Design an enzyme around this catalytic site. Sequence first.
Site, PDB file in Angstrom:
ATOM      1  N   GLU A  60       0.813  -1.206   0.000  1.00 39.06           N
ATOM      2  CA  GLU A  60       0.000   0.000   0.000  1.00 39.06           C
ATOM      3  C   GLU A  60       0.848   1.259   0.000  1.00 39.06           C
ATOM      4  O   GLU A  60       0.567   2.206  -0.739  1.00 39.06           O
ATOM      5  CB  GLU A  60      -0.908  -0.051   1.220  1.00 39.06           C
ATOM      6  CG  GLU A  60      -1.882   1.069   1.387  1.00 39.06           C
ATOM      7  CD  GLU A  60      -2.754   0.832   2.604  1.00 39.06           C
ATOM      8  OE1 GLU A  60      -2.535  -0.189   3.292  1.00 39.06           O
ATOM      9  OE2 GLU A  60      -3.653   1.650   2.879  1.00 39.06           O
ATOM     10  N   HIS A  61       1.908   1.274   0.792  1.00 40.85           N
ATOM     11  CA  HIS A  61       2.765   2.444   0.866  1.00 40.85           C
ATOM     12  C   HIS A  61       3.513   2.651  -0.435  1.00 40.85           C
ATOM     13  O   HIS A  61       3.861   3.781  -0.790  1.00 40.85           O
ATOM     14  CB  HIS A  61       3.759   2.253   1.995  1.00 40.85           C
ATOM     15  CG  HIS A  61       3.124   1.842   3.280  1.00 40.85           C
ATOM     16  ND1 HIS A  61       2.727   0.546   3.524  1.00 40.85           N
ATOM     17  CD2 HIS A  61       2.838   2.543   4.401  1.00 40.85           C
ATOM     18  CE1 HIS A  61       2.207   0.471   4.735  1.00 40.85           C
ATOM     19  NE2 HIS A  61       2.266   1.667   5.290  1.00 40.85           N
TER      20      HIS A  61
END
Lengths: 446, 33, 419, 151, 18, 55, 49
Positions: A60-61
């Site tokens: 996600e990051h």
Amino acid sequence: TATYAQALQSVPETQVSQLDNGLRVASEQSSQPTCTVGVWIDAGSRYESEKNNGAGYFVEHLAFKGTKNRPGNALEKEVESMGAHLNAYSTREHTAYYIKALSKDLPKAVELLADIVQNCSLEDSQIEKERDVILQELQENDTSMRDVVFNYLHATAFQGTPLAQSVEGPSENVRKLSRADLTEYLSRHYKAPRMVLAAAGGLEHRQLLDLAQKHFSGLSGTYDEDAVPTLSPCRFTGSQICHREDGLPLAHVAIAVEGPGWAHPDNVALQVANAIIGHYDCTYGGGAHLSSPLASIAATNKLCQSFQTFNICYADTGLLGAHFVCDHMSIDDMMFVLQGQWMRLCTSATESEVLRGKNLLRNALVSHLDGTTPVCEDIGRSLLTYGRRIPLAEWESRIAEVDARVVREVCSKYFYDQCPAVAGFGPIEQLPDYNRIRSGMFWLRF
Amino acid sequence: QLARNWVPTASLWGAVGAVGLVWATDWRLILDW
Amino acid sequence: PQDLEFTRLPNGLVIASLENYAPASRIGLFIKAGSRYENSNNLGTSHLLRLASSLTTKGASSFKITRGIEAVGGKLSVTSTRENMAYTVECLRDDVDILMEFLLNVTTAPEFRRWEVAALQPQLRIDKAVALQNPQAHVIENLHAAAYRNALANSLYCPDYRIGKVTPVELHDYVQNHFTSARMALIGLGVSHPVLKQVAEQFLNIRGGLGLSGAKAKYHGGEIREQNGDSLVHAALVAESAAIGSAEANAFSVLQHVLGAGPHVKRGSNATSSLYQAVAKGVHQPFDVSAFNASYSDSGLFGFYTISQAASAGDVIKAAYNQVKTIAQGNLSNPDVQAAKNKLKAGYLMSVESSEGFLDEVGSQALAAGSYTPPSTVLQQIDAVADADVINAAKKFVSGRKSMAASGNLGHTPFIDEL
Amino acid sequence: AALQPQLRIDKAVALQNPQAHVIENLHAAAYRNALANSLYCPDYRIGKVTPVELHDYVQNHFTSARMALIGLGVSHPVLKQVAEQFLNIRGGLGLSGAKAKYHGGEIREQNGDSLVHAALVAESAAIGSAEANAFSVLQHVLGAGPHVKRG
Amino acid sequence: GRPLVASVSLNVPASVRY
Amino acid sequence: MTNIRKSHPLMKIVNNAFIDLPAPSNISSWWNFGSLLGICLILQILTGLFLAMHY
Amino acid sequence: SHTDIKVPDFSDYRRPEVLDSTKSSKESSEARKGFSYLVTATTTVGVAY
């Protein structure tokens, strides 16, 4: 005009379109200079393996660290060039990538966005950087006790299911994590039909779909398998968990029982019982004259600092219960109260108080519906949930359905004489043993 | 306020008492088997 | 449906209305009375008064009131700042009348019952406390003192010896002192004007009296340093900015988006802000800097609020401050400003697009102006900013009396003399 | 541990006298580092102090160079005897890096007294000087301690 | 920076913001 | 203590000498006698009474 | 850190009905509990006699 009955009538309707490779298209025209542009993906931890645990989270990051066509930090330097805010977040059952922007430069947006969805720079430069931050954060995550206990909460009910597991996953995996396994899960679940697209604003529908068209008509985004649709009904555990640490000043509590999934008739029938039983906090100006027996007593004798009730309905599952905070000597008495409310509902409840609950939920429903993003945001889950359905005016009709017997008959099912789950965080000790709570579920008629 | 519920419940407890009460003494009656 | 309808009265109180189609029907009521209007012995009153909300009206028992809103499903709100307190309320499209009627009785019909007043004494702190979780919270309040003397220096919270100090009467005057139908401004949203237009003149015509404006706040700088136990020292540097409603206020509102970074991307350290970058380059591992710009009626302040670790703060300040110099020296990028304009225009509209926020934006104009300006005109005016303006705008912040507020472990903390 | 509670009750009674609290603030306003140091414990510093931190400052700032012993009623030789005996330790000494760097300013605390208290100070000179005497003279010019009751 | 900030009291919820 | 039915007669609050009287975990059936002793006695009284009734 | 915790297995003391990980526990739950109570009630009939 604005008149509640008529007010339901005139709204820009749900729109839908479907491309070939499984992508969904949909929209609503708010007649607004701006558009929330967003994406929702149903790939969960419940899909993720025991190594994959927390990986997608780690992933996600990573997207915004640069991508294939756009190496590190060339991505946002175009984004903020427009002045359009940008954000992404994930969840156990969903992940949402989305943009908030003026409707003008959207032709780049999705094309910018489409690149990101699949084309990605996987570079262990960012990996180690991000590998560290998460590890850094993993330990920091003990600072907010709220999120903490829920982790306990799931794992105690859903033990033996991928649903029961940390979103970020256990720590050591993150170190062990390698971007090939990502590429797997990158390849695995980021295909369509798993993928879904929506937006709202001045956009209408067509002029979305034409400029949806080809990436991501498309870039495949495929449809093959990943078996199908890999999932399982999860086991429900009558049990208890306790982390006893007596140093801290206060001790959270959470208690719940399982409930119906997303799609299910009764899910709405139980929306009100919570709204009726309501909630309390230290800080209200409501005082002791509030209608909610809890907000009346919990302000009166301050038996707790505060509490609120939750509902979370999974695909197949649902979660009903509250979360409260009270003095280390005040714990018992919060409880003996709290069993009062649920139990008394199941029998002796009354149509009057129904109404005050009924109105609120109508308000809360209509309330949340303002604003670009939330409007945009419903669709994605709704699609992944009920499909296109935004049965706006129907929800009202749905409200008219609920009845005194209904709520009783509903709660009779899901409360009376059941096996509740108990989560705890120190200084718990006062909290009675299970065997009390259990006998405490079913009244003796008292 | 016309309590609606608890009407049937009491209907049991009453029958709960009377029968067991008759059961306590157990005198002249009809059915045996 | 129908666009903004705002109507002067003889009382001069603007009744602004729109017609919606939505079942959400809300109303709001604005008032000029802020913290600046509290006196040396009047301190914390509004802050206390802001907790006068739920109390017993002269029209009804507060019990009936409270059981009233819930069983209907409506919702009440109250909001204030250093300047304009606002009483907000909302419910379904249909039932506003019952609710709306009560909006009056509170502001119209006060009762301070010596017993009913006592129970609210305990309450202030628990409220007052939770606001000070955020260190920046406590930092800001101190700041208005350092930069001023009288007005804006007034807290939004009650200095604690002032606690037992406040009588019903002291309130009771400030009620009617600062209330007038000249100052009062009423805003409808989902409801037709005539209904709005009707009752407005009816109850709300009272006097007269007191707007008393004798507070110019007299910008007077200085610096304040509290010795505290935080690992992350917090500090800010401010040379006074201009009044609200000015191209300068816009120029700084532009000048911020130059350096001023709100994240437009999650977790992204904003590179388009040279500030953080020009800092983060020469600087070491975690920290933050953002630029602070705010204005009130007569004037406002511009600054930047720093968060760093023990040793770093000065250079964190200095470099950033030195980086400010860079701008002040004739450094310019038109596209950046242009992008910043794009940011602002969007950021503005993205701010404004929200109705509830815009609901404020309505009356935020009203008590300021009393007219309405389409954001288009703003967007136009947004364009109207010259660069040499924003150039010399920053120069001012360099060119004038500056002020500091600092709290934490201060061992390494420089003064403004180091600056 | 038992001495943690004690500080405040001590620290408090010193602040009966308003002038007491006023003075302590003053050294801050006129200085930066050294004399600005309180004679009392800022309250977050309370739970802060370990035996060790003490234990060092013990031996850090102790030395037989700094230590000075004064007898009064007792003969020198008895005094003279034991003095060298135990009291010869090190060394280490004396940490003079505090010049206090006079740096003025002003501080105003908002309080609830009817009688406001304030003072105005331009720095005077070092101890042990005719100037220190000159001001010590200059005070008795204006400076009034009562030499007569109530007068 | 900030607006600067705000405060809230009201009824059903409660908070402070910037 | 809000609406606890064990307060109303205070006598019920003396009752919490039992129901919340805590006890260690491990306890042998060795400990069951103190109970029995009192119980062995109760019966005594009664029977030792009815005797007298015809005695 | 905290999340490093996990649930070890209690399947042992269990009985097989809900022992599966993929099953709705409610299926037996009706029949499941009644066994526990059927004991409890029948215990009483004797006491009463």
